[PDB]
């Protein structure tokens, strides 16, 4: 439209294209290659690669139909002739290498990580997307958000966006832009991310800012359709990162912020020396982070605590408890050759700890080396309960922190409906995978299957309900299993859960008790295979997850699931001086949180966002077709599009339909279900492009977009006709005024011509002369 605001948003296409020569042939580097057939031979087709101009043969049933240049960089792929893994991957990759990272796949959106900042989220751009219908303007995440808003409003129901993808794809970035968007069409909300991310994110090999907890944030709306409140829910924070961090990875962001000197004044409040590589608990893996300024992030994090409305004590309570942790791990120990129970190796660092937590350093190390009926602990039983304490504190801090930020957001204002956003942590496969991962992965599964249900299983059901016409289609997309292998009655977790309650148990009775139940009785469970990546640590079994095969090491899974902190120290801290400090298995508990989340989701009109990691190098604008293609597979994109083209994804309640499309045949409207029977009848609408329904109308694909076309047109005309009416009124109003002047001018014109000709009369001349 010439609008500068569309530089990396609007698509910028002819000849050399034979619909019978040109096709898609499998490739190892690119996934699919542009080929031109040369010679058939039963099944052995011989094609020529357009790129290098090399030649090869390919089974006839392995050729894929290419799409005509007509659909270059298409905005909506459901509109393409061919929706196959090679047409899709080509369209995306086409757009992507041109700045366009958003593309509709039918009813849901696709976001391909840019790995660079784009001027597409400005307020300039937000202005243009407001109240726009998806077909009206380029593909964008705003459109997805803007539309969910309109639906909640007009349809009067809760909306929801499940933003999925792999780890490092764009789940978080996009979740934030959605809220930032909905917020712009407030300040504290936006500001809750900086603090939650500082405490629940960390550098990882995959992500320099990896989210380590699940986030579900609901945004409430009032009777005028404006933001009237908001709440946050979090899930499974990586208690383990606190004390441990695999190489090339960092602990949570805060710890590094705290040792930078962004606010020197605080150094003495926390008792920290501005050196991170000084504290064991946070210098195991990485220290710095290409493109993360811990100095400035600390400042902004501090700045954000203020805006959130945190008293200075409150926000210093936080900072201290977390700096305290930086010390729990500095407390050295020793034995004393004899019994070993264990003795300390100083007390300097163990005091700073008791100090910051407002408890007696004495009473501490005491209830830590001989927990009370007493029961002394050896030299490791201690260093490990130290960690048990660090982890458990941090899990309470993070939980309290969220409760508090909700205090600041649960405005008691009036709520109608809401729009939730789900960002759960995604699939990740590392050199070594343990309980933490199974938990994240089980989580991510889960979700995918939701999309499968609501997308295929679901669609057809409604067709039945309404009582239309149709024949089933098996998209063969179910993971209930994988899901089942892990969650069901005798599943993996259930086995582990019943294994914890036994003090006798160990890493081998658990490992054996596992094969005992699923080896050969469930094909998803398979003995550990062979290395597909160097440094591949131990593996005890493998699981075939939607997006990958994961070799899991079950060592230490029993303690990891049954937590354990000296019930003694919990007494010390129970009555500590600091006011903050003073204030079921994990598996079962989480399984339950998750089930509850899912339950909350189902009651929604979901809009899906699909994130995609372009490559394994973290560098921008570079594509790895294999990987890409691979995602376009385990995510169900293609199928996700077939039904949009195949079936009838629209649906309208006659009540809301009559109200919006009456203005298209009003000279035929004298019951909402018959009125529409009329309108759509008047329009002489093809029985094909639509269907009956008991309570709702079903319009084939695109048709509704086209009805909003005709809808506008009429609305524009009518507006003109009333302007015409106003033009005609004003004219006719000044009609008297125009008869009078027509006469009043003829007087003057005829009566001056007289006095003019009378002076050109000799007689009069001479007369006038005599006068005196």
């Amino acid at each position: 439209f010439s609008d500068p605001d569309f530089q990396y948003l609007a698509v910028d296409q002819t000849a050399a294209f034979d619909g019978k020569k040109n096709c898609w042939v499998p490739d190892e580097k690119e996934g699919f290659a542009s080929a031109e057939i040369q010679s058939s031979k039963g099944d052995e087709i011989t094609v020529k690669i357009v790129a290098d101009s090399s030649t090869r043969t390919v089974k006839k049933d392995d050729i894929q139909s290419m799409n005509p240049p007509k659909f270059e960089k298409l905005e909506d792929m459901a509109n393409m002739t061919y929706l196959n893994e090679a047409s899709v991957l080509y369209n995306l990759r086409s757009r992507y290498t041109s700045g366009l990272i958003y593309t509709y796949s039918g009813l849901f959106c696709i976001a391909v990580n840019p790995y660079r900042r784009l001027p597409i989220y400005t307020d300039s751009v937000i202005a243009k997307y407001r109240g726009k219908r998806k077909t009206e303007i380029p593909p964008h995440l705003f459109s997805v958000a803007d539309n969910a808003y309109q639906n909640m409003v007009t349809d009067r129901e809760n909306q929801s966006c499940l933003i999925t993808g792999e780890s490092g794809a764009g789940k978080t970035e996009n979740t934030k832009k959605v809220i930032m968007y909905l917020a712009k069409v407030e300040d504290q909300i936006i500001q809750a991310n900086p603090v939650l991310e500082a405490y629940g994110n960390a550098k990882t090999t995959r992500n320099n800012n990896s989210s380590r907890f699940g986030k579900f944030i609901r945004i409430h709306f009032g009777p005028t359709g404006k933001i009237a409140g908001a709440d946050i829910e979090t899930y499974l924070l990586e208690k383990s990162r606190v004390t441990y961090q695999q190489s090339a990875e960092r602990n949570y962001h805060i710890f590094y912020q705290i040792c930078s000197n962004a606010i020197p004044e605080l150094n003495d409040v926390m008792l920290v020396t501005p050196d991170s590589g000084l504290y064991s608990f946070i210098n195991q893996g990485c220290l710095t982070v290409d493109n993360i300024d811990d100095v400035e992030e600390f400042k902004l994090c501090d700045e954000a605590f203020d805006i959130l409305g945190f008293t200075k004590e409150e926000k210093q309570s936080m900072f201290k408890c977390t700096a305290s942790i930086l010390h729990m791990g500095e407390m050295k120990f020793k034995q004393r050759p004899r019994e070993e129970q264990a003795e300390s190796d100083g007390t300097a660092e163990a005091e700073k700890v008791a100090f910051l937590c407002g408890i007696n350093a004495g009473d501490l190390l005491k209830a830590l080396l001989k927990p009370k009926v007493t029961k002394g602990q050896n030299m490791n039983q201690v260093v490990n309960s130290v960690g048990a304490l660090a982890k458990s504190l941090y899990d309470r801090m993070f939980n309290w922190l969220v409760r508090r930020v909700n205090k600041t957001l649960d405005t008691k204002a009036k709520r109608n409906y809401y729009i939730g956003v789900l960002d759960i942590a995604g699939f990740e496969i590392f050199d070594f995978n343990s309980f933490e991962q199974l938990c994240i992965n089980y989580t991510n599964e889960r979700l995918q299957q939701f999309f499968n249900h609501h997308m295929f299983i679901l669609e057809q059901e409604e067709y039945k309900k309404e009582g239309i016409a149709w024949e089933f289609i098996d998209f063969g997309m179910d993971l209930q299993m994988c899901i089942d292998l892990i969650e069901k009655p005798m599943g993996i977790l259930s086995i582990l859960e019943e294994e914890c309650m036994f003090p006798k148990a160990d890493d081998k009775s658990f490992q054996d008790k596992l094969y005992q139940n699923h080896m050969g009785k469930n094909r998803m469970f398979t003995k550990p295979g062979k290395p597909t990546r160097p440094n591949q640590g131990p593996a005890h079994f493998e699981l075939h997850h939607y997006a990958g095969n994961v070799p899991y090491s079950i060592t230490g899974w029993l303690e990891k699931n049954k937590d354990p902190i000296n019930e003694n120290v919990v007494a010390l801290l129970g009555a500590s001086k600091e006011p903050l400090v003073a204030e079921q298995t994990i598996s079962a508990v989480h399984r339950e949180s998750l089930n509850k989340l899912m339950k909350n989701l189902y009651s929604t009109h979901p809009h899906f966002v699909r994130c995609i990691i372009p490559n394994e190098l973290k560098q921008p604008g570079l594509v790895d077709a294999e990987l890409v293609l691979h995602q376009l597979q385990c995510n169900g994109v293609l199928e996700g599009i077939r039904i949009c083209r195949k079936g009838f994804p629209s649906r309208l309640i006659y009540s809301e339909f009559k109200q919006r499309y009456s203005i298209l045949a009003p000279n035929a409207i004298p019951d909402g279900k018959t009125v529409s029977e009329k309108i759509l009848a008047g329009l002489q609408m093809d029985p094909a492009e639509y269907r009956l329904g008991t309570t709702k109308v079903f319009f084939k694909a695109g048709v509704l977009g086209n009805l909003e076309e005709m809808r506008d047109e009429r609305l524009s005309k009518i507006i003109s006709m009333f302007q015409a009416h106003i033009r005609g009124y004003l004219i006719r109003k000044a009609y008297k005024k125009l008869q009078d002047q027509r006469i009043g001018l003829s007087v003057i014109q005829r009566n001056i011509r007289k006095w003019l000709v009378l002076r050109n009369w000799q007689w009069w001349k001479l007369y006038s002369k005599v006068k005196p």
């Binding site: 009518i718 009416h725 009124y729 004003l730």
Partner: protein, 151 residues
């Protein structure tokens, strides 16, 4: 009909006279002419039959005029239903209101725009008034405009 064509005649004069009497009218006025005989065509409408964007462009006799009016007759006129419908799409409350500011926007900004003058005009004519919140019952307004300058 005759009494009809006579009416075209009547008005044709008042006009052909004002842009210099000579038995010809500036095609740029063909609109206003018909707007006087009751009808309210749309600018899109008028140009379709012969109207022009500017004066001077061209003048027309009564001979060529007859069909322009035959034309602008068969063209659609907006009913009360239609004006009510369209105006509803700007009412979030649903209670027949709108603000001055917005109404102004609809007239001046959407559809075949209307100068800012014609607006303050018809406002003052129909004597449309806003309340304390600065809102107006669009139902009343539509009724007046529909009414005529002399009801």
């Amino acid at each position: 009909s005759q009494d009809e064509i006579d009416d075209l005649k009547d008005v044709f004069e008042l006009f052909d006279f004002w842009d210099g009497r000579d038995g010809a009218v500036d095609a740029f006025k063909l609109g206003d002419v018909c707007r006087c005989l009751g009808i309210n065509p749309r600018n899109e409408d008028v140009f379709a039959v012969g109207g022009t964007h500017k004066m001077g462009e061209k003048s027309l006799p009564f001979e060529e005029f007859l069909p322009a009016y035959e034309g602008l007759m068969d063209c659609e006129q907006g009913t009360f239903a239609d004006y009510m419908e369209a105006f509803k799409t700007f009412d979030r409350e649903g209670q027949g209101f709108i603000s001055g500011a917005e109404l102004r926007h609809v007239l001046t900004a959407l559809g075949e725009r209307l100068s800012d003058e014609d607006v303050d005009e018809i406002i003052k004519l129909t004597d449309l008034q806003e309340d304390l919140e600065g809102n107006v019952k669009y139902e009343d307004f539509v009724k007046k405009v529909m009414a005529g300058p002399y009801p």
